[PDB]
């Protein structure tokens, strides 16, 4: 029973993904530049205020 | 099994069964309703509820096909963001075994074929619908998947460094630096590139990596 | 053992007997072994008060008429091959003319033998396997091998005179087409669906006309071959197809006068001003030669695996794969008599050259029929 | 403690004397790539430099490395060539 | 109350046209000095005629084309010597159905020039007993008994129109089966031998045929091309009517 | 028109229905109008029996709707799957959820029959059943009756004077006659097999020096009964030609010598067809071994009829050397990347070796916990030199659970249990823990092994086992044997396929209250503690400080369920000074596999086991480390621990108290003389052998051919003692004769259940001797 009386409206129990080290760039030193990126694994900056974790509900609207 | 009833009461009792929490009865009723009247008003609702029932019941192989069919047949549905989020969530949940995590072993250097698909789907959702109610969770999962892929590549580079294949580790770390130049994995993997450049006596090239790690030592 | 792995098919039961007459067997003698479940044209022949017959193995019997007396018997098994005891696999129709008998086999070998002694007059290898009854005419023996290669053996000694390359489709029906000779020109239907007339004494095509139908419903199956023997009368050639166009056409390179949507693989006969035939699904029809207007259609028999109908005393005798013999009146299509002559089953055409009637069972013996 | 087995490790670009002698100063990227082949490694930090490593160690009997460094300009001209047959740092 | 009488393929035969045709044929017979048998038989014959008309109209209305109404008006004005729109409609239907039937029959017959074939009048009634494509179930049998009964009752002296409307299948059953003026060289080949022995005022017995057992009764005693084309057209049209009726779906509502 | 009343609108919207009629509300109506409206309702193809009714109050229409297809049933489809049938019905539009058309059903039926033309069924009959259901619905049944499949009557080959027809037919696949004794197929004709069979015929004539031979044409005739099929093939075998010389040329890339050696053929031997393609493939493999992965090799023969000779010209073109950019594995959801990548002979950033990648794939197969391992070399899109290597692997259920207790003939409970993994969460370790806790014994064995302690592959393993075989509840007379041992082994590979192992071990053993047995007293007198033969009160202690060695050769295609190769495993332990015992023991296991078909299905298995142990000097090998045979793993057909000698019971007062007519082994009031018993004491020499014929399963299709194995086995075994004395017994049997070769034969089935490999075996002994207990049915987990 996946519902289990409190698991009826949220994602699977594991939530290790909430705690992740924030991504920080590498400073370019003098006399050289870091290699140009590829633009295939990047995340844009977007407004927050969206419920995450078990707060967000997953059931058809 | 199921009776030959009009969609009203069968749909109502399927909803009641799902609200109770018994997934098997709900999935059987929804399958019967979809196979009975695959033209009626409830078809979209039937599919959107079948996806949820598949995901909760741990039937991801069928869920992926159902999501693909729904997104293909309705490329302009008002709630495509929900189905995209469900696809990106089931692809990521397929990457966990629920038994390895009991002992705490890191599921990072395993086969990253589902993590890449989940990252692609989450990126597609974020690009397509910036103003939805799933964007923050999608971005958090994107960051987690990026870190996981970086750690996998770092593990492969570490194995090549241990064996003594310096060209291979140089190429792997260069790929990490070109693709993932912000994750902690690259920051911890730069010394491997330093050592690999050191082994081939190419000190002139090694000084550049030394400067890279010195400028970011803080 | 595959009989237990196949579902039972539906076949129309035999009708009421109403035996007005009960023919009997004049002599129920036997010839060789049986050809078995091998579709071939190996009917016996009758001439000069004797009858010639052969089996699948290669044995040839000449038998006396008016009784079951066995005149002589020879063996045509290959005594000169790799094993020197191989079966010849005789399949060409046993034809007789003068003092000669012509037989064909599915080994590209056509044999001609002298009568009253059974000695091999000669043999000849032809292009492809012989599968049609040789036709003797104008000092030549026309054969229609199952490759589209119509051939003409020299009667005197046996040699290739010329060849004609008829078309051949990919999944053709059986090609047992016997050419017929009129006014020094041969007419023959290939497996493509085109009836062609060829100048015999020079080896040049005179004309070719397509007698077939459209692609129909499905391309798979739905064959369009013409393996029945064209019949020439009054300068008119009659031919039949598988899907069907009962075509009557002018002999002097003329076009067609009419056609019908009727398709047969067995032989059809022309008597007086009427055409009698049996087609696929085993229906016996009598039609008018003037415009192909159907006179009557007896169809109570259905999928009985009939044979070529024959004339006898003004009525139609029809064989059956169940060993029965059915008798049909010339008009009104009403049944007249039934005869359970044998249980082996019939597959070849009856012969009615004289007042006698002969039928050869596929797995058994020959049979003579009285009134 | 040196009796265990070890597969021979190949890491280089497999340079040969004829191929390196074929190259002369003043060529372009396309024809040098056609002559030698794509480099398996090149610096991603500062400029356009091509490294041709030939590293080969059989079992335990030493290590043999031949190094080639090609320095190019902005317009893809072979500005400088340098070769090193063995490990200078002995 | 236009309840659909029968269903054929897609279209249907209603009840309005049935009554209309009954009234038209009754009035025309009255002005042509004719009488009528039991009304149930007339109604059934009219219903069968409309079923045939609809099934032949389906193959030629969904395809082919229509007829220009100006030539239709000229033709009706010329042939002249109730509701105007209705009668115009039935005349248009008759013209289009005649055109499509003529086209379909002309497709099925080829005529070589009469030179290779080289080279009196009768007014007669044609009674036909319809037969199925495979009368294996002994249809021809009862059918034969009915044919002999019809011949007997014609000998007894009953009205020819009655026996014609009784169990005919030709399109002239509503007019006694008349075929107009026909020459001995303008008749089917199954009829020439009968005509040779035929005589005015007598009856010719049934002739076996694929279409059915024909009954021929004699009432009154570049040319070769049309002479042979007429008989070929008649025979092949009868056969094609039989084929089309056999190869269709018909549902009867009662 | 004031209103319109509808009687019979259930599945049709009233608005669209009203739109259907040309007339609507507030319109003048007459006969022509209503007639045209009825015709218009039937123009849309939605109704079946509509009719207007005489109603003074405005309009009244009764409408009958075409029923909706509720479900479709396909009863009778013996040889056709239902999903394809449903797709075919969809193709004509008869899918569930649409109105049923009575007009279309016949066509529907026809369509189904046409589909059967594909399979080979021609006289098929399909019947449509329309079962009414309330709410205006129908249930559709398609009753099938497939008549017969096409049957080949005879394949004929016309024109030849060198070979017979039967010889050529015997190598085809469309057998025209199946023997009445063997039935491994039917005479079913498929268009796809014709090309393959014709290619077989062409190769058969080509390889025997027929260069000018070609296929004229072929005909596939159908009899006019839609049941029989004839096949005719025309040929022109030509003449016998001989090969003369080879003139290979092209861009050899400096490899002319060994290539010429590869193509070197002596003149005078006839032309061949398989030789040319074998030589081309060998040249391609040799070129690929040095780096040239994508060459172009063409063979062209020039034939001269003056001497009927043929000269073969081979044009070879070696392309650019291919390097490897990255090798990545897919499908390893459990096993980590390091486990797969640590066994590879081709490495990133190196010139490609077509043999190194194959060695890597074979090593992955030999590892033992991968079901299928497929290699794939994909060209890099934007590069002409670089290539990628991908290993597609599918995981398998490694590990095993061993359970069961054993309560036969009211025996004591033994809750034994064991877990084997061979892979711990994919980490590559080998962890195994087993044993039982009991009121009369205790067993606990734990084994850990890391096979890659270093990079090269040294394996470090340890094993700790504590076993108290007490057999004791309350009485002291039981043979109490308490022993704890710890073993540590280190192994390393030398050359290839060969591993050596050396290790240390400590075993502390103690025996008390031992039953009188002659071998026991012989061992004790070898140590010469001089025990008495009239009392059961004995104490024995020993501390073995041993030294273990071993050698392993393993070259076989698959780690589990092998089909080719050989394995040899030698293990031997020797004592060193400082222990109470002095002995040496060696054991040797061998398993050889030989395939028969090129497809590797029928297998010949040859298994042997040998064992010899003897004291170093003065001392003799202890009885508690003896050898044993029989059981479900060594000689199938006998109970475990049965082969070999039998114990002799010294009778005396303290041997058995004889309480309540129990303990009747050698008690003084139940026996007086030395007796030969049925208890099996192990011998110090063992030799067993076994021959297995492994055949494909006759019960399961090919989708699970590598899940269960069936084998007919014949086993031989013997065990004997060396330090035996013959004349010391006047008439007791001599257990030192290595001649009583116990034999057995039977059948065996192996299946990997999700608890381990379960083995069933039925064996019937063919040779039996005194004291040899035989069991026919055996079952184990292993």
Numbering used by the authors:
A (entry chain C): 25 to 85
B (entry chain D): 26 to 243
C (entry chain B): 22 to 392
D (entry chain E): 24 to 113
E (entry chain F): 25 to 105, 123 to 160, 172 to 273, 395 to 427
F (entry chain A): 26 to 807
Copy out sentences from the published article reporting this entry, exactly as the authors wrote them.
The outer membrane is a formidable barrier that protects Gram-negative bacteria against environmental threats. Its integrity requires the correct folding and insertion of outer membrane proteins (OMPs) by the membrane-embedded β-barrel assembly machinery (BAM). BamA is composed of a 16-stranded β-barrel, which, in E. coli, is preceded N-terminally by five polypeptide transport associated (POTRA) domains that extend into the periplasm. Unfolded OMPs are delivered to BAM by the periplasmic chaperone SurA, but how SurA and BAM work together to ensure successful OMP delivery and folding remains unclear. The results suggest that SurA binds BAM at its soluble POTRA-1 domain, which may trigger conformational changes in both BAM and SurA that enable transfer of the unfolded OMP to the BAM lateral gate for insertion into the outer membrane.
Given the importance of the BAM-SurA interface for OM biogenesis and the fact that BAM and SurA do not form a sufficiently stable complex to allow its co-purification from cells, the BAM-SurA complex with an in vivo formed disulphide cross-linked at residues K27C (SurA) and R76C (BamA), was purified directly from the E. coli OM. The structure of the complex (shown schematically in Fig. 3a) was then determined by cryoEM, revealing the structure of the BAM complex with additional density corresponding to SurA at the expected location adjacent to POTRA-1 of BamA. Interestingly, two distinct conformations of BAM-bound SurA were observed. Both conformations showed the expected BamA-SurA β-augmentation interface, but they differ in the conformation of the bound SurA molecule. One structure has SurA in a ‘Compact’ conformation (PPIase-1 bound to Core), while in the other SurA is in an ‘Extended’ (PPIase-1 released from Core) state. BAM is in a Lateral Open conformation in each structure, as judged by the position of POTRA-5 and the conformation at the lateral gate, and indeed in the Compact structure, a salt bridge appears to be formed between BamD and POTRA-2 (BamD-D28 and BamA-R162) which is observed in all BAM Lateral Open structures solved to date. The Core domain interacts similarly with both POTRA-1 and POTRA-2 of BamA in the two structures, forming a discrete structural unit. However, the position of this unit relative to BamB, and the resulting interactions made between the SurA Core domain and BamB, is different, with SurA bound at blades 7 and 8 of the β-propellor of BamB in the Compact state,, but moving to blades 6 and 7 in the Extended state. This shifting around BamB results in an ~ 18 Å movement of POTRA-1 between the two structures.
